[PDB]
Amino acid sequence: IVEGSDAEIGMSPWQVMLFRKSPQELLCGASLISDRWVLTAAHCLLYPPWDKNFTENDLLVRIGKHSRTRYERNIEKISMLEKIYIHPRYNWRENLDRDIALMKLKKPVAFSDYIHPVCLPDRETAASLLQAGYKGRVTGWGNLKETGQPSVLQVVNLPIVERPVCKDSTRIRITDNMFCAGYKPDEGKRGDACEGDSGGPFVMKSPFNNRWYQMGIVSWGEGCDRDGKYGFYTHVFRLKKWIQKVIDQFG
Amino acid sequence: EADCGLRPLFEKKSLEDKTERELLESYI
Amino acid sequence: DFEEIPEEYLQ
Ligand SMILES: N=C(N)c1ccc(CNC(=O)[C@@H]2CCCN2C(=O)[C@@H](CC2CCCCC2)NS(=O)(=O)Cc2ccccc2)cc1
Ligand SMILES: *[C@@H]1O[C@H](CO)[C@@H](O)[C@H](O)[C@H]1NC(C)=O
Ligand code: NA
Ligand code: NA
């Protein structure tokens, strides 16, 4: 996260770290959506242009974390993966369309002060909140700058941007399964997700029921925090039918 | 599920985090 | 740069 700040303790208890077993290192962010399901970006697991194709046994999920590098004894919990599900129409070839994946844990994780699931949006909450200018929140342990790394989880609040402005900021073909967020050059404030924040959640707090909803997944961006560029996020609601199908079938 | 999105150290105790109001204020 | 995690999780 660029131009963010340290998270408060327990501020994002659905935040998950995807951790490579060997070498031991951060792979991506992710989010907890139930006691046995974790949501992330497909490109965290599968990206052939960079020779990336992780299998279940390659990875661990670390839940309840705050420090990036420390083993947070008595606080974090580490889970193994039973199965990875990548969206069948994830477009790694062109534009990261449908950049979404689910991971089923081998065993349910125990909830605690530090570990708790985020909600997924219904159609109405999505329609109400996914509006230009409305702010969401992104969290992660990724780079502090485009080209270093944080001691603890970082957080930044960013406004959703009008679709034509998103489109006009890039040569990539944008789809309805994406949205973009960030400040404009003339707005003064700044901030963005970055490398390593991949797969983490873009959340909004509903003013109707005071619950946090995951509206997006950190997907892509041209560098980080560049003037005139925006961060792109997988549109979770648009892909929720797939999420539900997977959980209903394999849950 | 039923309890999703309510943080033990914040909503469950009626404590606000330092910047959540920034989100609310944008929901105009 | 990461602290070693308990071996039980790597088995
Ligand atoms: N600025 C952001 N909001 C942001 C930056 C990086 C990410 C992580 N995602 C990625 O790195 C993804 C996966 C492969 C290529 N990629 C990118 O974002 C590419 C743009 C993709 C290319 C493929 C077609 C869709 C657009 N830009 S990129 O500059 O390489 C991302 C990057 C890499 C390393 C350091 C900083 C930034 C996610 C978000
Ligand atoms: C990635 O890994 C799987 C399993 O090993 C393999 O079958 C597949 O062809 C690889 N490439 C994909 C899914 O694009
Ligand atoms: Na364009
Ligand atoms: Na920008």
PDB file of all heavy atoms in Angstrom, chain A residues 217-251, unseen atoms left out:
ATOM      1  N   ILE A 217     -11.598  -6.859  -5.094  1.00  0.00           N
ATOM      2  CA  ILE A 217     -10.360  -7.585  -4.829  1.00  0.00           C
ATOM      3  C   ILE A 217      -9.251  -6.832  -5.556  1.00  0.00           C
ATOM      4  O   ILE A 217      -9.396  -6.509  -6.738  1.00  0.00           O
ATOM      5  CB  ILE A 217     -10.417  -9.024  -5.377  1.00  0.00           C
ATOM      6  CG1 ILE A 217     -11.597  -9.791  -4.771  1.00  0.00           C
ATOM      7  CG2 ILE A 217      -9.093  -9.744  -5.132  1.00  0.00           C
ATOM      8  CD1 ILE A 217     -11.909 -11.084  -5.485  1.00  0.00           C
ATOM      9  N   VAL A 218      -8.138  -6.566  -4.872  1.00  0.00           N
ATOM     10  CA  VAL A 218      -7.000  -5.919  -5.524  1.00  0.00           C
ATOM     11  C   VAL A 218      -6.534  -6.752  -6.720  1.00  0.00           C
ATOM     12  O   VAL A 218      -6.114  -7.904  -6.557  1.00  0.00           O
ATOM     13  CB  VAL A 218      -5.817  -5.744  -4.539  1.00  0.00           C
ATOM     14  CG1 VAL A 218      -4.603  -5.144  -5.270  1.00  0.00           C
ATOM     15  CG2 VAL A 218      -6.200  -4.874  -3.344  1.00  0.00           C
ATOM     16  N   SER A 219      -6.596  -6.160  -7.914  1.00  0.00           N
ATOM     17  CA  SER A 219      -6.344  -6.903  -9.145  1.00  0.00           C
ATOM     18  C   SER A 219      -5.130  -6.393  -9.915  1.00  0.00           C
ATOM     19  O   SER A 219      -4.150  -7.118 -10.071  1.00  0.00           O
ATOM     20  CB  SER A 219      -7.603  -6.908 -10.033  1.00  0.00           C
ATOM     21  OG  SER A 219      -7.402  -7.669 -11.211  1.00  0.00           O
ATOM     22  N   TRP A 220      -5.172  -5.149 -10.381  1.00  0.00           N
ATOM     23  CA  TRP A 220      -4.088  -4.661 -11.230  1.00  0.00           C
ATOM     24  C   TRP A 220      -3.971  -3.153 -11.211  1.00  0.00           C
ATOM     25  O   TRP A 220      -4.877  -2.447 -10.764  1.00  0.00           O
ATOM     26  CB  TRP A 220      -4.215  -5.211 -12.663  1.00  0.00           C
ATOM     27  CG  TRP A 220      -5.427  -4.775 -13.450  1.00  0.00           C
ATOM     28  CD1 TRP A 220      -6.638  -5.402 -13.505  1.00  0.00           C
ATOM     29  CD2 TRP A 220      -5.516  -3.652 -14.343  1.00  0.00           C
ATOM     30  NE1 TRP A 220      -7.485  -4.731 -14.361  1.00  0.00           N
ATOM     31  CE2 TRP A 220      -6.821  -3.654 -14.888  1.00  0.00           C
ATOM     32  CE3 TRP A 220      -4.623  -2.645 -14.734  1.00  0.00           C
ATOM     33  CZ2 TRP A 220      -7.254  -2.687 -15.809  1.00  0.00           C
ATOM     34  CZ3 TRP A 220      -5.053  -1.686 -15.642  1.00  0.00           C
ATOM     35  CH2 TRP A 220      -6.358  -1.712 -16.164  1.00  0.00           C
ATOM     36  N   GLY A 221      -2.837  -2.673 -11.702  1.00  0.00           N
ATOM     37  CA  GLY A 221      -2.586  -1.254 -11.791  1.00  0.00           C
ATOM     38  C   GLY A 221      -1.284  -1.048 -12.533  1.00  0.00           C
ATOM     39  O   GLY A 221      -0.389  -1.901 -12.498  1.00  0.00           O
ATOM     40  N   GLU A 222      -1.170   0.093 -13.193  1.00  0.00           N
ATOM     41  CA  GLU A 222       0.018   0.408 -13.963  1.00  0.00           C
ATOM     42  C   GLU A 222       0.998   1.139 -13.054  1.00  0.00           C
ATOM     43  O   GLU A 222       0.863   2.340 -12.811  1.00  0.00           O
ATOM     44  CB  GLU A 222      -0.372   1.255 -15.164  1.00  0.00           C
ATOM     45  CG  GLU A 222      -1.290   0.529 -16.123  1.00  0.00           C
ATOM     46  CD  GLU A 222      -2.036   1.484 -17.029  1.00  0.00           C
ATOM     47  OE1 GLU A 222      -1.419   2.021 -17.970  1.00  0.00           O
ATOM     48  OE2 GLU A 222      -3.229   1.719 -16.775  1.00  0.00           O
ATOM     49  N   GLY A 223       1.982   0.410 -12.540  1.00  0.00           N
ATOM     50  CA  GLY A 223       2.796   0.934 -11.455  1.00  0.00           C
ATOM     51  C   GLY A 223       1.946   1.091 -10.197  1.00  0.00           C
ATOM     52  O   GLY A 223       0.966   0.373 -10.010  1.00  0.00           O
ATOM     53  N   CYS A 224       2.319   2.021  -9.323  1.00  0.00           N
ATOM     54  CA  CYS A 224       1.543   2.279  -8.110  1.00  0.00           C
ATOM     55  C   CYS A 224       1.530   3.764  -7.784  1.00  0.00           C
ATOM     56  O   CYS A 224       2.570   4.417  -7.788  1.00  0.00           O
ATOM     57  CB  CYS A 224       2.119   1.515  -6.916  1.00  0.00           C
ATOM     58  SG  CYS A 224       2.402  -0.224  -7.252  1.00  0.00           S
ATOM     59  N   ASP A 225       0.345   4.282  -7.480  1.00  0.00           N
ATOM     60  CA  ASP A 225       0.169   5.665  -7.049  1.00  0.00           C
ATOM     61  C   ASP A 225       0.675   6.691  -8.057  1.00  0.00           C
ATOM     62  O   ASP A 225       1.111   7.768  -7.673  1.00  0.00           O
ATOM     63  CB  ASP A 225       0.793   5.911  -5.668  1.00  0.00           C
ATOM     64  CG  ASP A 225       0.279   7.182  -5.020  1.00  0.00           C
ATOM     65  OD1 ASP A 225      -0.939   7.431  -5.107  1.00  0.00           O
ATOM     66  OD2 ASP A 225       1.085   7.931  -4.430  1.00  0.00           O
ATOM     67  N   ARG A 226       0.611   6.369  -9.344  1.00  0.00           N
ATOM     68  CA  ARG A 226       1.001   7.341 -10.361  1.00  0.00           C
ATOM     69  C   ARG A 226      -0.128   8.329 -10.612  1.00  0.00           C
ATOM     70  O   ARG A 226      -1.306   7.947 -10.621  1.00  0.00           O
ATOM     71  CB  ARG A 226       1.376   6.659 -11.676  1.00  0.00           C
ATOM     72  CG  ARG A 226       2.561   5.724 -11.593  1.00  0.00           C
ATOM     73  CD  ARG A 226       2.938   5.253 -12.983  1.00  0.00           C
ATOM     74  NE  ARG A 226       3.946   4.201 -12.951  1.00  0.00           N
ATOM     75  CZ  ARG A 226       4.306   3.481 -14.007  1.00  0.00           C
ATOM     76  NH1 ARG A 226       3.747   3.703 -15.191  1.00  0.00           N
ATOM     77  NH2 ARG A 226       5.227   2.538 -13.881  1.00  0.00           N
ATOM     78  N   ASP A 227       0.224   9.597 -10.813  1.00  0.00           N
ATOM     79  CA  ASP A 227      -0.770  10.597 -11.179  1.00  0.00           C
ATOM     80  C   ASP A 227      -1.452  10.185 -12.475  1.00  0.00           C
ATOM     81  O   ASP A 227      -0.786   9.869 -13.464  1.00  0.00           O
ATOM     82  CB  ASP A 227      -0.129  11.973 -11.386  1.00  0.00           C
ATOM     83  CG  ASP A 227       0.318  12.624 -10.090  1.00  0.00           C
ATOM     84  OD1 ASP A 227      -0.093  12.171  -9.003  1.00  0.00           O
ATOM     85  OD2 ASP A 227       1.077  13.611 -10.166  1.00  0.00           O
ATOM     86  N   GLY A 228      -2.780  10.200 -12.474  1.00  0.00           N
ATOM     87  CA  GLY A 228      -3.533   9.921 -13.680  1.00  0.00           C
ATOM     88  C   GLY A 228      -3.819   8.451 -13.905  1.00  0.00           C
ATOM     89  O   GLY A 228      -4.518   8.103 -14.854  1.00  0.00           O
ATOM     90  N   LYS A 229      -3.267   7.595 -13.044  1.00  0.00           N
ATOM     91  CA  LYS A 229      -3.570   6.168 -13.062  1.00  0.00           C
ATOM     92  C   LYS A 229      -4.441   5.842 -11.863  1.00  0.00           C
ATOM     93  O   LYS A 229      -4.495   6.605 -10.894  1.00  0.00           O
ATOM     94  CB  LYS A 229      -2.291   5.325 -13.007  1.00  0.00           C
ATOM     95  CG  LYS A 229      -1.331   5.555 -14.179  1.00  0.00           C
ATOM     96  CD  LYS A 229      -1.975   5.157 -15.501  1.00  0.00           C
ATOM     97  CE  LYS A 229      -0.990   5.227 -16.654  1.00  0.00           C
ATOM     98  NZ  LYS A 229      -1.640   4.802 -17.925  1.00  0.00           N
ATOM     99  N   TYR A 230      -5.119   4.702 -11.940  1.00  0.00           N
ATOM    100  CA  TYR A 230      -6.016   4.261 -10.881  1.00  0.00           C
ATOM    101  C   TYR A 230      -5.779   2.792 -10.604  1.00  0.00           C
ATOM    102  O   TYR A 230      -5.258   2.067 -11.448  1.00  0.00           O
ATOM    103  CB  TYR A 230      -7.478   4.523 -11.280  1.00  0.00           C
ATOM    104  CG  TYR A 230      -7.690   5.999 -11.502  1.00  0.00           C
ATOM    105  CD1 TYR A 230      -7.535   6.566 -12.762  1.00  0.00           C
ATOM    106  CD2 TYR A 230      -7.956   6.841 -10.432  1.00  0.00           C
ATOM    107  CE1 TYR A 230      -7.676   7.927 -12.946  1.00  0.00           C
ATOM    108  CE2 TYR A 230      -8.100   8.196 -10.608  1.00  0.00           C
ATOM    109  CZ  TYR A 230      -7.960   8.739 -11.866  1.00  0.00           C
ATOM    110  OH  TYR A 230      -8.100  10.101 -12.027  1.00  0.00           O
ATOM    111  N   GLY A 231      -6.136   2.358  -9.406  1.00  0.00           N
ATOM    112  CA  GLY A 231      -6.103   0.945  -9.107  1.00  0.00           C
ATOM    113  C   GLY A 231      -7.360   0.255  -9.611  1.00  0.00           C
ATOM    114  O   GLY A 231      -8.462   0.823  -9.524  1.00  0.00           O
ATOM    115  N   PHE A 232      -7.195  -0.966 -10.119  1.00  0.00           N
ATOM    116  CA  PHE A 232      -8.328  -1.748 -10.599  1.00  0.00           C
ATOM    117  C   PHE A 232      -8.607  -2.936  -9.686  1.00  0.00           C
ATOM    118  O   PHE A 232      -7.682  -3.597  -9.166  1.00  0.00           O
ATOM    119  CB  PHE A 232      -8.122  -2.189 -12.052  1.00  0.00           C
ATOM    120  CG  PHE A 232      -8.325  -1.068 -13.025  1.00  0.00           C
ATOM    121  CD1 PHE A 232      -7.318  -0.131 -13.247  1.00  0.00           C
ATOM    122  CD2 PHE A 232      -9.536  -0.916 -13.691  1.00  0.00           C
ATOM    123  CE1 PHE A 232      -7.518   0.924 -14.116  1.00  0.00           C
ATOM    124  CE2 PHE A 232      -9.734   0.133 -14.566  1.00  0.00           C
ATOM    125  CZ  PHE A 232      -8.724   1.049 -14.779  1.00  0.00           C
ATOM    126  N   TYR A 233      -9.900  -3.190  -9.498  1.00  0.00           N
ATOM    127  CA  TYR A 233     -10.395  -4.147  -8.515  1.00  0.00           C
ATOM    128  C   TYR A 233     -11.415  -5.059  -9.175  1.00  0.00           C
ATOM    129  O   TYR A 233     -12.254  -4.611  -9.966  1.00  0.00           O
ATOM    130  CB  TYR A 233     -11.062  -3.393  -7.347  1.00  0.00           C
ATOM    131  CG  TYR A 233     -10.089  -2.495  -6.628  1.00  0.00           C
ATOM    132  CD1 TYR A 233      -9.816  -1.220  -7.100  1.00  0.00           C
ATOM    133  CD2 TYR A 233      -9.382  -2.953  -5.521  1.00  0.00           C
ATOM    134  CE1 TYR A 233      -8.890  -0.409  -6.483  1.00  0.00           C
ATOM    135  CE2 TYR A 233      -8.450  -2.145  -4.893  1.00  0.00           C
ATOM    136  CZ  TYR A 233      -8.211  -0.869  -5.378  1.00  0.00           C
ATOM    137  OH  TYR A 233      -7.277  -0.058  -4.763  1.00  0.00           O
ATOM    138  N   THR A 234     -11.342  -6.344  -8.854  1.00  0.00           N
ATOM    139  CA  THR A 234     -12.373  -7.282  -9.294  1.00  0.00           C
ATOM    140  C   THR A 234     -13.705  -6.921  -8.645  1.00  0.00           C
ATOM    141  O   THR A 234     -13.756  -6.682  -7.449  1.00  0.00           O
ATOM    142  CB  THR A 234     -11.991  -8.690  -8.883  1.00  0.00           C
ATOM    143  OG1 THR A 234     -10.653  -8.951  -9.311  1.00  0.00           O
ATOM    144  CG2 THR A 234     -12.951  -9.711  -9.457  1.00  0.00           C
ATOM    145  N   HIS A 235     -14.769  -6.875  -9.446  1.00  0.00           N
ATOM    146  CA  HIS A 235     -16.100  -6.502  -8.979  1.00  0.00           C
ATOM    147  C   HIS A 235     -16.744  -7.747  -8.361  1.00  0.00           C
ATOM    148  O   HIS A 235     -17.275  -8.613  -9.064  1.00  0.00           O
ATOM    149  CB  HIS A 235     -16.882  -6.010 -10.201  1.00  0.00           C
ATOM    150  CG  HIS A 235     -18.152  -5.281  -9.901  1.00  0.00           C
ATOM    151  ND1 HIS A 235     -19.116  -5.744  -9.026  1.00  0.00           N
ATOM    152  CD2 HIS A 235     -18.650  -4.146 -10.447  1.00  0.00           C
ATOM    153  CE1 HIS A 235     -20.138  -4.905  -9.029  1.00  0.00           C
ATOM    154  NE2 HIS A 235     -19.877  -3.926  -9.878  1.00  0.00           N
ATOM    155  N   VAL A 236     -16.684  -7.846  -7.038  1.00  0.00           N
ATOM    156  CA  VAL A 236     -17.113  -9.051  -6.342  1.00  0.00           C
ATOM    157  C   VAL A 236     -18.583  -9.384  -6.588  1.00  0.00           C
ATOM    158  O   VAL A 236     -18.932 -10.536  -6.881  1.00  0.00           O
ATOM    159  CB  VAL A 236     -16.810  -8.955  -4.828  1.00  0.00           C
ATOM    160  CG1 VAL A 236     -17.443 -10.121  -4.064  1.00  0.00           C
ATOM    161  CG2 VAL A 236     -15.303  -8.948  -4.634  1.00  0.00           C
ATOM    162  N   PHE A 237     -19.460  -8.392  -6.472  1.00  0.00           N
ATOM    163  CA  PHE A 237     -20.863  -8.690  -6.685  1.00  0.00           C
ATOM    164  C   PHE A 237     -21.137  -9.276  -8.069  1.00  0.00           C
ATOM    165  O   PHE A 237     -21.924 -10.211  -8.198  1.00  0.00           O
ATOM    166  CB  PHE A 237     -21.789  -7.508  -6.457  1.00  0.00           C
ATOM    167  CG  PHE A 237     -23.194  -7.861  -6.781  1.00  0.00           C
ATOM    168  CD1 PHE A 237     -23.913  -8.681  -5.928  1.00  0.00           C
ATOM    169  CD2 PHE A 237     -23.764  -7.491  -7.988  1.00  0.00           C
ATOM    170  CE1 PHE A 237     -25.184  -9.082  -6.248  1.00  0.00           C
ATOM    171  CE2 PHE A 237     -25.049  -7.894  -8.314  1.00  0.00           C
ATOM    172  CZ  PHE A 237     -25.752  -8.684  -7.441  1.00  0.00           C
ATOM    173  N   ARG A 238     -20.503  -8.731  -9.104  1.00  0.00           N
ATOM    174  CA  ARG A 238     -20.753  -9.223 -10.458  1.00  0.00           C
ATOM    175  C   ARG A 238     -20.383 -10.693 -10.609  1.00  0.00           C
ATOM    176  O   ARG A 238     -20.895 -11.378 -11.498  1.00  0.00           O
ATOM    177  CB  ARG A 238     -19.958  -8.406 -11.477  1.00  0.00           C
ATOM    178  CG  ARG A 238     -20.490  -7.013 -11.723  1.00  0.00           C
ATOM    179  CD  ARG A 238     -21.340  -6.987 -12.964  1.00  0.00           C
ATOM    180  NE  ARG A 238     -20.634  -7.594 -14.087  1.00  0.00           N
ATOM    181  CZ  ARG A 238     -21.224  -7.988 -15.209  1.00  0.00           C
ATOM    182  NH1 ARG A 238     -22.535  -7.842 -15.356  1.00  0.00           N
ATOM    183  NH2 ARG A 238     -20.508  -8.537 -16.181  1.00  0.00           N
ATOM    184  N   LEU A 239     -19.487 -11.174  -9.752  1.00  0.00           N
ATOM    185  CA  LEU A 239     -19.023 -12.553  -9.833  1.00  0.00           C
ATOM    186  C   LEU A 239     -19.582 -13.421  -8.708  1.00  0.00           C
ATOM    187  O   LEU A 239     -19.169 -14.566  -8.517  1.00  0.00           O
ATOM    188  CB  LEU A 239     -17.492 -12.588  -9.850  1.00  0.00           C
ATOM    189  CG  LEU A 239     -16.903 -11.868 -11.069  1.00  0.00           C
ATOM    190  CD1 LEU A 239     -15.422 -11.652 -10.906  1.00  0.00           C
ATOM    191  CD2 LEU A 239     -17.191 -12.636 -12.351  1.00  0.00           C
ATOM    192  N   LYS A 240     -20.549 -12.888  -7.974  1.00  0.00           N
ATOM    193  CA  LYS A 240     -21.046 -13.595  -6.804  1.00  0.00           C
ATOM    194  C   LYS A 240     -21.800 -14.878  -7.149  1.00  0.00           C
ATOM    195  O   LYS A 240     -21.802 -15.830  -6.366  1.00  0.00           O
ATOM    196  CB  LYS A 240     -21.912 -12.686  -5.941  1.00  0.00           C
ATOM    197  CG  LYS A 240     -22.218 -13.281  -4.579  1.00  0.00           C
ATOM    198  CD  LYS A 240     -23.015 -12.340  -3.721  1.00  0.00           C
ATOM    199  CE  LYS A 240     -23.293 -12.964  -2.366  1.00  0.00           C
ATOM    200  NZ  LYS A 240     -24.145 -12.086  -1.532  1.00  0.00           N
ATOM    201  N   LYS A 241     -22.443 -14.920  -8.311  1.00  0.00           N
ATOM    202  CA  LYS A 241     -23.145 -16.142  -8.708  1.00  0.00           C
ATOM    203  C   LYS A 241     -22.158 -17.303  -8.781  1.00  0.00           C
ATOM    204  O   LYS A 241     -22.465 -18.423  -8.367  1.00  0.00           O
ATOM    205  CB  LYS A 241     -23.861 -15.955 -10.042  1.00  0.00           C
ATOM    206  N   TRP A 242     -20.966 -17.033  -9.299  1.00  0.00           N
ATOM    207  CA  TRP A 242     -19.926 -18.052  -9.343  1.00  0.00           C
ATOM    208  C   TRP A 242     -19.461 -18.454  -7.941  1.00  0.00           C
ATOM    209  O   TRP A 242     -19.326 -19.643  -7.638  1.00  0.00           O
ATOM    210  CB  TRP A 242     -18.731 -17.586 -10.178  1.00  0.00           C
ATOM    211  CG  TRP A 242     -17.609 -18.558 -10.113  1.00  0.00           C
ATOM    212  CD1 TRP A 242     -17.511 -19.745 -10.784  1.00  0.00           C
ATOM    213  CD2 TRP A 242     -16.436 -18.458  -9.298  1.00  0.00           C
ATOM    214  NE1 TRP A 242     -16.341 -20.382 -10.448  1.00  0.00           N
ATOM    215  CE2 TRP A 242     -15.662 -19.614  -9.538  1.00  0.00           C
ATOM    216  CE3 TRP A 242     -15.960 -17.501  -8.394  1.00  0.00           C
ATOM    217  CZ2 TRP A 242     -14.442 -19.841  -8.902  1.00  0.00           C
ATOM    218  CZ3 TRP A 242     -14.745 -17.727  -7.767  1.00  0.00           C
ATOM    219  CH2 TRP A 242     -14.000 -18.884  -8.028  1.00  0.00           C
ATOM    220  N   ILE A 243     -19.205 -17.461  -7.092  1.00  0.00           N
ATOM    221  CA  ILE A 243     -18.815 -17.731  -5.707  1.00  0.00           C
ATOM    222  C   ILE A 243     -19.816 -18.659  -5.036  1.00  0.00           C
ATOM    223  O   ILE A 243     -19.440 -19.661  -4.422  1.00  0.00           O
ATOM    224  CB  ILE A 243     -18.692 -16.430  -4.867  1.00  0.00           C
ATOM    225  CG1 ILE A 243     -17.577 -15.533  -5.412  1.00  0.00           C
ATOM    226  CG2 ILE A 243     -18.440 -16.760  -3.394  1.00  0.00           C
ATOM    227  CD1 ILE A 243     -17.466 -14.183  -4.705  1.00  0.00           C
ATOM    228  N   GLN A 244     -21.096 -18.327  -5.161  1.00  0.00           N
ATOM    229  CA  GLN A 244     -22.153 -19.107  -4.527  1.00  0.00           C
ATOM    230  C   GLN A 244     -22.240 -20.520  -5.087  1.00  0.00           C
ATOM    231  O   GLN A 244     -22.478 -21.480  -4.352  1.00  0.00           O
ATOM    232  CB  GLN A 244     -23.501 -18.398  -4.672  1.00  0.00           C
ATOM    233  CG  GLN A 244     -23.735 -17.307  -3.644  1.00  0.00           C
ATOM    234  CD  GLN A 244     -23.849 -17.853  -2.233  1.00  0.00           C
ATOM    235  OE1 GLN A 244     -23.630 -17.137  -1.257  1.00  0.00           O
ATOM    236  NE2 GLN A 244     -24.197 -19.130  -2.120  1.00  0.00           N
ATOM    237  N   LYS A 245     -22.050 -20.645  -6.398  1.00  0.00           N
ATOM    238  CA  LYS A 245     -22.099 -21.951  -7.048  1.00  0.00           C
ATOM    239  C   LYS A 245     -21.002 -22.856  -6.500  1.00  0.00           C
ATOM    240  O   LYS A 245     -21.241 -24.029  -6.198  1.00  0.00           O
ATOM    241  CB  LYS A 245     -21.962 -21.802  -8.565  1.00  0.00           C
ATOM    242  CG  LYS A 245     -21.964 -23.119  -9.326  1.00  0.00           C
ATOM    243  CD  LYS A 245     -21.815 -22.890 -10.824  1.00  0.00           C
ATOM    244  CE  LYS A 245     -21.694 -24.206 -11.578  1.00  0.00           C
ATOM    245  NZ  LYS A 245     -20.477 -24.968 -11.178  1.00  0.00           N
ATOM    246  N   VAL A 246     -19.801 -22.302  -6.355  1.00  0.00           N
ATOM    247  CA  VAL A 246     -18.675 -23.064  -5.839  1.00  0.00           C
ATOM    248  C   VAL A 246     -18.913 -23.505  -4.395  1.00  0.00           C
ATOM    249  O   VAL A 246     -18.715 -24.670  -4.049  1.00  0.00           O
ATOM    250  CB  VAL A 246     -17.355 -22.270  -5.928  1.00  0.00           C
ATOM    251  CG1 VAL A 246     -16.251 -22.983  -5.170  1.00  0.00           C
ATOM    252  CG2 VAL A 246     -16.960 -22.058  -7.385  1.00  0.00           C
ATOM    253  N   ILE A 247     -19.348 -22.579  -3.550  1.00  0.00           N
ATOM    254  CA  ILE A 247     -19.567 -22.897  -2.150  1.00  0.00           C
ATOM    255  C   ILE A 247     -20.737 -23.868  -1.990  1.00  0.00           C
ATOM    256  O   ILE A 247     -20.676 -24.784  -1.172  1.00  0.00           O
ATOM    257  CB  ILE A 247     -19.760 -21.617  -1.311  1.00  0.00           C
ATOM    258  CG1 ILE A 247     -18.451 -20.819  -1.286  1.00  0.00           C
ATOM    259  CG2 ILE A 247     -20.202 -21.964   0.107  1.00  0.00           C
ATOM    260  CD1 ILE A 247     -18.557 -19.455  -0.638  1.00  0.00           C
ATOM    261  N   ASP A 248     -21.786 -23.692  -2.788  1.00  0.00           N
ATOM    262  CA  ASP A 248     -22.944 -24.583  -2.712  1.00  0.00           C
ATOM    263  C   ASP A 248     -22.588 -26.003  -3.136  1.00  0.00           C
ATOM    264  O   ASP A 248     -23.090 -26.971  -2.569  1.00  0.00           O
ATOM    265  CB  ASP A 248     -24.101 -24.063  -3.570  1.00  0.00           C
ATOM    266  CG  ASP A 248     -24.791 -22.855  -2.959  1.00  0.00           C
ATOM    267  OD1 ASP A 248     -24.477 -22.503  -1.802  1.00  0.00           O
ATOM    268  OD2 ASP A 248     -25.661 -22.265  -3.636  1.00  0.00           O
ATOM    269  N   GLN A 249     -21.719 -26.122  -4.134  1.00  0.00           N
ATOM    270  CA  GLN A 249     -21.356 -27.424  -4.690  1.00  0.00           C
ATOM    271  C   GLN A 249     -20.284 -28.144  -3.874  1.00  0.00           C
ATOM    272  O   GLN A 249     -20.323 -29.364  -3.726  1.00  0.00           O
ATOM    273  CB  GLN A 249     -20.890 -27.263  -6.140  1.00  0.00           C
ATOM    274  CG  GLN A 249     -20.456 -28.558  -6.812  1.00  0.00           C
ATOM    275  CD  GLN A 249     -20.201 -28.381  -8.298  1.00  0.00           C
ATOM    276  OE1 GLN A 249     -20.659 -27.413  -8.907  1.00  0.00           O
ATOM    277  NE2 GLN A 249     -19.464 -29.316  -8.890  1.00  0.00           N
ATOM    278  N   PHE A 250     -19.333 -27.387  -3.338  1.00  0.00           N
ATOM    279  CA  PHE A 250     -18.164 -27.977  -2.694  1.00  0.00           C
ATOM    280  C   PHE A 250     -18.103 -27.706  -1.194  1.00  0.00           C
ATOM    281  O   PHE A 250     -17.226 -28.222  -0.500  1.00  0.00           O
ATOM    282  CB  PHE A 250     -16.880 -27.482  -3.370  1.00  0.00           C
ATOM    283  CG  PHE A 250     -16.794 -27.829  -4.831  1.00  0.00           C
ATOM    284  CD1 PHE A 250     -17.007 -26.862  -5.801  1.00  0.00           C
ATOM    285  CD2 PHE A 250     -16.514 -29.125  -5.232  1.00  0.00           C
ATOM    286  CE1 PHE A 250     -16.934 -27.180  -7.145  1.00  0.00           C
ATOM    287  CE2 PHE A 250     -16.441 -29.450  -6.576  1.00  0.00           C
ATOM    288  CZ  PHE A 250     -16.651 -28.477  -7.533  1.00  0.00           C
ATOM    289  N   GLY A 251     -19.035 -26.899  -0.699  1.00  0.00           N
ATOM    290  CA  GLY A 251     -19.071 -26.547   0.709  1.00  0.00           C
ATOM    291  C   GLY A 251     -19.412 -27.725   1.601  1.00  0.00           C
ATOM    292  O   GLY A 251     -19.004 -27.768   2.764  1.00  0.00           O
TER     293      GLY A 251
END
